[PDB]
Amino acid sequence: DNLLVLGIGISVHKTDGVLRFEKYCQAHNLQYMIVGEGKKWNGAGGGQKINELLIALESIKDNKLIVVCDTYDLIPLSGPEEILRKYRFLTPDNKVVFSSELYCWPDASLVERYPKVDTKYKYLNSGAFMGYRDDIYEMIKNGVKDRDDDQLFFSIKFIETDKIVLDYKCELFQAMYRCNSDLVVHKNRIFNGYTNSYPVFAHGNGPAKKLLNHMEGYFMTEPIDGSSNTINTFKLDNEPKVFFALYVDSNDLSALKQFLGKVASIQYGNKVIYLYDRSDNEQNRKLIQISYPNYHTGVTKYVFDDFKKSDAQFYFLLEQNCIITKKDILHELIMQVKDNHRVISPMIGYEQNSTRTNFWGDIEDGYYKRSENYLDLAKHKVRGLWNVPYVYGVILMHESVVRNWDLSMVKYNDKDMDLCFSLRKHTIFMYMINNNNYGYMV
Ligand SMILES: [Mn+2]
């Protein structure tokens, strides 16, 4: 009746993936520990995961039933009772149950060595497994190289011993990659229509991180508060310090004045404001600097150095073409910042065309792709927080993101695309929020 979940999360600072994993664990009353928390990542690869798990197993002396799983791209959707029932049904012999998956990876030549089975879910995936501590210890007691492939290691174990059984019917585990057409969200669960099951652990393995991120906006960790927007004015009892970073171009003095007027109307007591001007019109700067002394010229990238030197707890990035009309927006946004929700961007559309917005629901080779629910979100058919690959122009970011992670990585040579690229690379999530009417773009 006892169960412990060992989620692998090796990092000096916590990603949003691990934060989300933890929140889902707590919501389902799953006892867990994060293996490798606070330690540096080294690890095809992932050998360090086995090495860190071995260390963790040294503190578990009793022969406990344990789950071992990825955390960055994985969430539990049910509690210990369901997991225990399924485990006992899957393996009366108390073997180690591993996730199945569609592909034979990383060694495609193991194909002929796997047991033949009717299902397309033929192969092992090492991102989730469950068994007795002693059995798992026995398999890993000698360690591996940090750079070894944990998936290959366990695949060999599976084909060459009798210690492991695969979860072919996706009862405990779902490797979601390329299973889009099998899976639907129903009653706060994933239902797999292929296997006729409701997998407990939803693993967005490999690229399927985007499928899991997409579904996340439909799940809940507890019943929603239906009165959350009944009063849609917001005011914090205590205002944390917010650093306003304004990305402007004084070449267009008209746009600048209109934008600064809206920014000045955002209601917020505890702030510091910096202007980062693309241009260098000196007479303009002189004028504006009377009201905004923190003024820098020739800036064509996003700047975090001033923020880092400040004692601000939030960074609020605002682009000149983004017109905020909801005066209490910062109170509203800050109230949503908690757990894995650390980067939040209010949805606004073009004044001329309101379905074209400051977020992308999907991405393909780096650029905008229309997602399944994009138009629903843009027209407010459903509202809330949505995990998306790109946000633009109005972004609130908690200091734990800005102070601890490299947000200046370059792939596209485009400041807004590169910010989102950096976040994606670190498993820091961007949340679009569409709870109210916030503004528009010009
Ligand atoms: Mn994974």
From Swiss-Prot:
GO molecular function, a single term: procollagen-lysine 5-dioxygenase activity
Name used for this protein in its record: Uncharacterized protein R699
Pfam family, one: GT_PLOD
Domain of life of the source: Viruses
InterPro entries (UniProt xref): Collagen_mod_GT25
Organism lineage string: Viruses, Varidnaviria, Bamfordvirae, Nucleocytoviricota, Megaviricetes
